[PDB]
Amino acid sequence: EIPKDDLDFRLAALYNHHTGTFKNKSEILTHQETIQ
Amino acid sequence: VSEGFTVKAMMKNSVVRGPPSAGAFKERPTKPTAFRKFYERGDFPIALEHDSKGNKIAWKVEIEKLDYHHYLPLFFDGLCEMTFPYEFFARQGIHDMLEHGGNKILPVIPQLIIPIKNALNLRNRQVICVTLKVLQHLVVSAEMVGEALVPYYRQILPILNIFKNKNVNSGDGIDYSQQKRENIGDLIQETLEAFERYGGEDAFINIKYMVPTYESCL
């Protein structure tokens, strides 16, 4: 679950800041539950 | 599929092809040489006798007195022959006339660079091994010679830079085929080693100008 906005950005997001390049506002906070 | 720097490759799974894979590391087609042409003629004073302890080339002439300026470049241009009764004659003639015979190699040295490049430029491994072995014998067979080759390092070493990365990767298993020195990486590193040992103090910067991965001793 998410009892904060920080955990929504933090845990379930699949974004790798070291790898992902030039992503927009929506491709950071994409979750695993969206895919499956 | 795609082609290159176009809107074809601007797509979403545009698979781009690749380059045409240029002519490096591939054996170039051979050409007839002057050695076979002069040998079928029969002007060479050599004859093959099969001794029990191996094949030995028999000379019907005093090997000390011979026009090296006419014979040594002719034998060196015969290294490009892969057919079996000619490669022995070229190799053994070079070895015998380099070992039996001194203080005549030096004026011939500016004439034998083009056959050496011709032998090395054929990208076959056996001929490269043989010309590296005879170059190692050549740079040590006489005096005053190794630092006479040092202006011509720009015409030998360019293809020596190709095959310095050819060794066996068997980490624990011993390479059994060590007596027949057929792997070319160590042979190239020993040839460059002999070019540094004999060749004076100007050889290192020339080898570095040709082979950039080189490590110097002394």
Binding site: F22 | F5, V16, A24, F25, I162, N165
Partner: protein, 436 residues
């Protein structure tokens, strides 16, 4: 205080240089009289890079004009901007080069190399510090090839820690203009590979193809090709003459674009080239510039870049543009055209930006590309040379002037040595086990 001494040799080099001076004089607002009445603020700033100021308020170029025929210097003098040069730097012989490398190099270059060396000594000593030299010529003619490279060899021996810039017009594959040009090109390249630090190869055929397909020109004269050459030969010195958000002079590009000390042959280009009607209906952005920069049609040399892997790419931009846009454009171009770039070099693109755009253009870019595509031009020259040399076609105009037969077969040897290393660095991968 970083100043460059300019030289031009031969009938092609003189026209190329004259168009070059016409271009950069209007860049800095210099009238044909030699006087400054431009409009921009930054024009008179770094004019000491290329010019000298005389008493009375004139601006003379730092140009030394060398010829072997006297009838080609007054054509340059009687041009639009031919009256700005000093008359003392006009060195010229009396007997023509005869399209002979022999007469350009050995027995009619030897008596005029002294005078031009004293003139270039006088020009390259009034400076406080010196960065390098420029020479514009062609590898097909007699005094464009035999004299200019001898001059390069005799200048390199005196200034060994300064850069050298050669902008050569190599003979075209299917466009033939002289009979004897393979001999001149083969004699010239083997010592243009050991005496200068940056060389640009421009083919007349590729320039014609650009003028036909890109520019949509009906009748392109020889002025338009020289304008094309000057549009990219002056884009590599705009970091010296104008401030930018990320500057890169000649030596910066010499370090970045040259991985190994011989592969310094480059392919120029210009980004915002557009037709006469398509100019007005055009949107000019950095992703718009990159497609015309990187395509094979805009290459000024007749070597297809799709035929080999890029070693290092330079892209000097002119105009007030963003940096993330150029950044992401080069990143995309490298990322999904991944098989056309060297994989043992991580990033192959150098980016430079300048704030002063060319006049009439709101955004421009110039391309310097070191590719293994250039290996086919040298092989083409060797193939066009070996047919003549096999039967000793025209050697009596050279050997009768005095040479040895080995002096022609060593040029081919150095040509093949140049080809093999480009082949090797094209096929070399990051690991050293996959080619065998």
């Amino acid at each position: 205080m970083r100043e460059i001494v300019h030289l031009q040799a031969g009938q092609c080099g003189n026209q190329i240089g004259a168009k070059f001076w016409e271009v950069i004089s209007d860049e800095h607002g210099i009238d044909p009289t030699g006087t400054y009445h431009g409009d921009s603020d930054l024009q008179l700033e770094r004019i000491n890079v290329y010019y000298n100021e005389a008493t009375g308020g004139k601006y003379v170029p730092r140009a030394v004009l060398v010829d072997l025929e006297p009838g080609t210097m007054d054509s340059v003098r009687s041009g639009p901007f031919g009256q700005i040069f000093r008359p003392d730097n006009f060195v010229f012989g009396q007997s023509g080069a005869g399209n002979n490398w022999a007469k350009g190099h050995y027995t009619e270059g030897a008596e005029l190399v002294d005078s031009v060396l004293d003139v270039v000594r006088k020009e390259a000593e009034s400076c406080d510090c010196l960065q390098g030299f420029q020479l514009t010529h062609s590898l097909g003619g007699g005094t464009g090839s035999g004299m200019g490279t001898l001059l390069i060899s005799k200048i390199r021996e005196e200034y060994p820690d300064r850069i050298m810039n050669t902008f050569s017009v190599v003979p075209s594959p299917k466009v033939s203009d002289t009979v004897v040009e393979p001999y001149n090109a083969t004699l010239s390249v083997h010592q243009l590979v050991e005496n200068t630090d940056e060389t640009y190869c421009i083919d007349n055929e590729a320039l014609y193809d650009i003028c036909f397909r890109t520019l949509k020109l009906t009748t392109p004269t020889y002025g338009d090709l020289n304008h094309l050459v000057s549009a990219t030969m002056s884009g590599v010195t705009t970091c010296l003459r104008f401030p930018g958000q990320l500057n890169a002079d000649l030596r910066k590009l010499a370090v970045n674009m040259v991985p190994f000390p011989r592969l310094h042959f480059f392919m120029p280009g210009f980004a915002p080239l557009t037709s006469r009607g398509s100019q007005q209906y055009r949107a000019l952005t950095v992703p718009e510039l990159t497609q015309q920069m990187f395509d094979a049609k805009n290459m000024m040399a007749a070597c297809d870049p799709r035929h080999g892997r890029y070693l290092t790419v330079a892209a000097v931009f002119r105009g007030r543009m963003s940096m993330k846009e150029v950044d992401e454009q080069m990143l995309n171009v490298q990322n999904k055209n991944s098989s056309y770039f060297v994989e043992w070099i991580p990033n192959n693109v150098k980016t430079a930006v300048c704030d002063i755009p060319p006049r009439g253009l709101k955004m421009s870019a110039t391309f310097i590309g070191n590719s293994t595509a250039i290996q086919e031009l040298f092989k083409r020259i060797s193939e066009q040379f070996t047919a003549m040399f096999r039967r000793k076609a025209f050697l009596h105009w050279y050997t009768g002037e005095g040479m040895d037969e080995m002096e022609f077969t060593e040029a081919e040897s150095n040509m093949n040595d140049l080809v093999s290393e480009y082949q090797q660095y094209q096929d070399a991968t990051a690991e050293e086990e996959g080619e065998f």
